[PDB]
Paper text:
Polycomb repressive complex 2 (PRC2) is an essential chromatin regulator that harbors histone methyltransferase (HMTase) activity mediated by its catalytic subunit enhancer of zeste homolog 2 (EZH2). PRC2 is the only known factor that establishes the trimethylation of lysine 27 of histone H3 (H3K27me3), a chromatin mark associated with transcriptional repression and whose tight spatiotemporal regulation is essential during development and differentiation. In addition to EZH2 (or its less active homolog EZH1), the core PRC2 complex consists of suppressor of zeste 12 (SUZ12), retinoblastoma-associated protein 46 or 48 (RBAP46/48), and embryonic ectoderm development (EED). The binding of EED to trimethylated-lysine-bearing peptides is central to PRC2 activity since it allosterically activates EZH2, a requirement for efficient trimethylation of H3K27.2 Upon engagement of specific methylated peptides by EED, a flexible loop of EZH2, the stimulatory-response motif (SRM), folds into a short α-helix and stabilizes an active conformation of EZH2 by bridging the EED ligand binding site and the critical SET-I helix of the EZH2 catalytic su(var), enhancer-of-zeste, and trithorax (SET) domain.
The linker histone H1 is another determinant of chromatin context that has been proposed to cooperate with PRC2 to suppress gene expression through an unknown mechanism. Interestingly, we were not able to detect nucleosome-bound PRC2 dimers when JARID2 was present in the complex, even when using a JARID2 construct that lacked its lysine 116 methylation site (PRC2J119–450) that would otherwise compete with PRC2dist binding to EED. Comparison of different PRC2 structures shows that even in the absence of K116me3, JARID2 likely outcompetes PRC2dist by sterically blocking the SUZ12-SUZ12 dimerization interface and/or impeding linker DNA binding by PRC2dist. Interestingly, cryo-EM analyses of PRC2 incubated with H1-bearing nucleosomes suggest that H1 binding and PRC2 dimerization are mutually exclusive since all reconstructions of PRC2 dimers lacked density for H1. On the other hand, we could see clear EM density corresponding to H1 when a PRC2 variant containing JARID2119–450 was used, a condition that prevents PRC2 dimerization. Notice that this PRC2J119–450 is seen in an inactive conformation, as expected given the absence of an allosterically activating methylated peptide, and also that there is no direct interaction between H1 and PRC2J119–450. Comparison of the nucleosome-H1, nucleosome-H1-PRC2J119–450, and nucleosome-PRC2prox-PRC2dist structures shows that H1 binding gives rise to a linker DNA trajectory that is not compatible with PRC2dist binding. Therefore, these observations indicate that genomic occupancy of H1 is incompatible with the trans-autoactivation of PRC2 by dimerization and agree with the latter being context specific as indicated by our genomic data.
Author numbering:
A (entry chain E): 17 to 122, 158 to 181, 220 to 297, 304 to 344, 431 to 751
B (entry chain G): 80 to 441
C (entry chain D): 583 to 682
D (entry chain Y): 170 to 208
Write the structure that this text describes.
Amino acid sequence: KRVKSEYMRLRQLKRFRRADEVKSMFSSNRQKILERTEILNQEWKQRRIQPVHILTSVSSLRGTRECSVTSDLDFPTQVIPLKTLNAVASVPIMYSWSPLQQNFMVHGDRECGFINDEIFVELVNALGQYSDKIFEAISSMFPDKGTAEELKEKYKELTEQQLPGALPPECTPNIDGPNAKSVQREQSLHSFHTLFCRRCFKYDCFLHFHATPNTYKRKNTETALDNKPCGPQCYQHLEGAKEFAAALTPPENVEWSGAEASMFRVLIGTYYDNFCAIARLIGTKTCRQVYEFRVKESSIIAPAPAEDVDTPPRKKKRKHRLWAAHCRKIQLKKDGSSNHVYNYQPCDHPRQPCDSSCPCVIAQNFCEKFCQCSSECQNRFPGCRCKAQCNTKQCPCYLAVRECDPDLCLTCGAADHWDSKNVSCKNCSIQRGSKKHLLLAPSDVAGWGIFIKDPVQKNEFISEYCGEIISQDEADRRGKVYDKYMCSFLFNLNNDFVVDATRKGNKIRFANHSVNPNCYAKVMMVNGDHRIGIFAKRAIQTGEELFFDYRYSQADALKYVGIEREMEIP
Amino acid sequence: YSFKCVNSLKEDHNQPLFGVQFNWHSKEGDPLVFATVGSNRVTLYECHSQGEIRLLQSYVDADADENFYTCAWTYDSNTSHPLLAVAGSRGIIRIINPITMQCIKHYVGHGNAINELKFHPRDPNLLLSVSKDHALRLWNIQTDTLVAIFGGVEGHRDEVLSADYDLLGEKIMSCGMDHSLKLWRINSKRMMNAIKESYDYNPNKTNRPFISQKIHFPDFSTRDIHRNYVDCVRWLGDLILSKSCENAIVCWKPGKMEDDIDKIKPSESNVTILGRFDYSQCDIWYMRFSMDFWQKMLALGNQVGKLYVWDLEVEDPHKAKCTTLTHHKCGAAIRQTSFSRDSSILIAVCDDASIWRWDRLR
Amino acid sequence: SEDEKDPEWLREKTITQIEEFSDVNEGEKEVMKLWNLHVMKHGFIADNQMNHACMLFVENYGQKIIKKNLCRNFMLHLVSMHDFNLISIMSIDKAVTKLR
Amino acid sequence: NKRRKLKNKRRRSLPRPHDFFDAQTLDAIRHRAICFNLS
Ligand SMILES: Nc1ncnc2c1ncn2[C@@H]1O[C@H](CSCC[C@H](N)C(=O)O)[C@@H](O)[C@H]1O
């Protein structure tokens, strides 16, 4: 039992030193208890306190009830009359939540999890204290097999001695930081490109891409290239320097820092020729020794591609009725089902055409401008040119589930005055979020409800139904949890997702249910994002209560929203 | 340890009994008054010698048919009159002045119910009412204006029922059925600005109502302490007590044992467990213990009606030399306990409308 | 209204989530903090707005860029958009003028 | 609306709108009434 005792005493070494320690801050807290308790006691001494007074009879209320607190012991039972407390009104029940104007995607057993590595270090002490009997004594207590041949393996795991840690392992400080390395053009943008998300053009978007960086080919000859002696010392001001620059389409003693050389590697990738603008950006060097070091860099590194294309199609031959054929195809094969609504996904076709293999095509949905399908893809939307307002049955975009994009319905001013609030269009509001003002009040039907502040007409935009993104299967689980207390905050956004407003959302989540509502729900497509809005089923005046059909099953409707609040006139 | 039952009274309503309160907000020589909340009745008593207890003025909520849950002694500096706030299942706060015999401060706004009441140790005009909707709201009763609210978007995803002030009122621990341990620092530069502004408000000053604040980011959180519901945590100075239904009481400090409580960042997740004052026969929650005024003596009741008693001296969970006091006549359910402003008088309350006073045998 | 472009708590949560990232140096980390907090402050949605946001963001915080001395990281952060076609060359020139 | 019937056309079952009266005033009125009948 000596090996267990050695193992126990090795474990005991930190055990009793803990006991020695705990006694210390036991004492240190105790004195802090004594200091503070006395201090507050002193102030309690300062605060004069009125002694209590006993109850007295009230003549006007002799009808009040009397209670006799029975004594469990021999003591007599004492009697003092009751008294009715003050009355206070009560408000409808409601659970906590947080405001939200967009959409957001989303024990107690064992100790410390892992077998303690310090005990391994305690086991290492068993390795150092070391013939065969020692090997198994080492191997018996700890789960390992610590024979001398295994001593080396444990020594091998000891030789790690350090961890790289949660940091960029490569020396990649911020360029503004003096320690920035001469990092190439690509590696620096890696952090930016990975974190950024263009679909909401924010870094680490909360509603979204990693497939490719901006690998698309772009024109490079759009520069004016008026190479003139404008940089005192430049590619110009010297015919030899200028002629050498043109043919390539020694730097002075002013050296280049690694950070300077690093973003020098970036600036060439932007212009490939604009030493002056590079010099304008790089105040550390004049245009000379920028062009010269560009010569030095271009001599060392491979020359840039600098390629431009124009594509065979130029104009016409793209009558939109041809697009009408394509969606007619899409409607006849798959979209005739009208039930499999898929969230948009950016299809990628680096060299493939927008064939039937297109993810958007198989998803029965148009390719968005975010897709890698080129500017000639036939699955993209054509442009929403409704002259008066992109807002009616003649508006294909209104006929579509897609809100007329700001860059498309140029005739309804969707792009015009994005800062301004009033536009000719009506089917552009959700982008601008021209929500109406609402009021919160206890609904007549059940608990809290929503009331509108101002009169509105039929089919007028109202506030969005914000929430959080959650998958269907978990919506079952949360919904499974929801039915145990008759809650409902899950909305079937599409065939693939359900939105929840239980924890995050805006005020509209408290809207009640009615079978004959003044408002109705309508899914919509916005910038590749599925959203649901509400519109007035009829014209509405000031102070109305709002309703819409939750559209569950008939049996489900009786289960939750059975209240109808209607008298029969006939 | 030096204690015995000397008195026991039972209320005639036979309703389950709830939070006890002894008026530690008194003066030297004042009558020793304590209060207790029943289902809808509220009763006050004063301990007396020989084992006698004189029933004091008692009221009943004959209008709100709800079970009162929590209460806290109150004091007014202006009139020097003590009071005592109450709360229950309907989530409404009433504060009765015994001098006024009545409550004239009405405060509503919590969602479902109130399960905790405690005042600021220094300012008697600040109160935390932990609620059923996971909400942590603060009221400036002196100005009747609301103060910052805690929880919200990143608060407890389950009902909180237990919270505590520290001795100086700088950090507030919070724990609920989610077994989460979230605390917030009062001393946060923003808050006392609002607290000062909470005392600086006029409804007639402007149409704009007072702007209470919102918090969602505790200075620390964890759940590893208990695998069952937690209902009893207290500020043992810089150390934190914690009790669950699993028949154990554990004390612990954030991070490592050398880590300052006030230096701990919100990103911290480490724990230092140094408490083993375990118990038994009390596998159900909604039981609350009591503390002496000087933080030197811990007494906890039992469902089977016994007592679990320990001191806060150098006696430590290294051995946990318990004192299991027991009265045979009380065995139904010890709902709560309450010390006096000393260590001489202990009042144990059973669920079946019966109380059991234990006096120190020193 | 009780409602606006962007709630306060959301600003706090996103800033905290930024610090979680380890591969990002603090020079960059501050860059999107200011730039992002600029975004849902105004909620731009168009490419034209994207450019207009550029001189707008530099106009408001160009001095703060000097104060943080995180300019060089900010030019690179600009170049990405020019790679993403949301930025033109003369737009980059505008930032240089605003900075200096 | 010409066919507007009586005011009863509201609802079938809705939450109670909460009574304005109170209990402790009710007892005081009763005892005031009781002592009123005593004379
Ligand atoms: N017409 C209706 N009658 C009864 N319950 C309804 C209802 N419409 C909605 N509900 C209930 O309300 C929940 C939606 S959240 C809205 C709650 C309700 N307006 C209140 O403040 O009390 C659903 O879980 C549903 O069960």
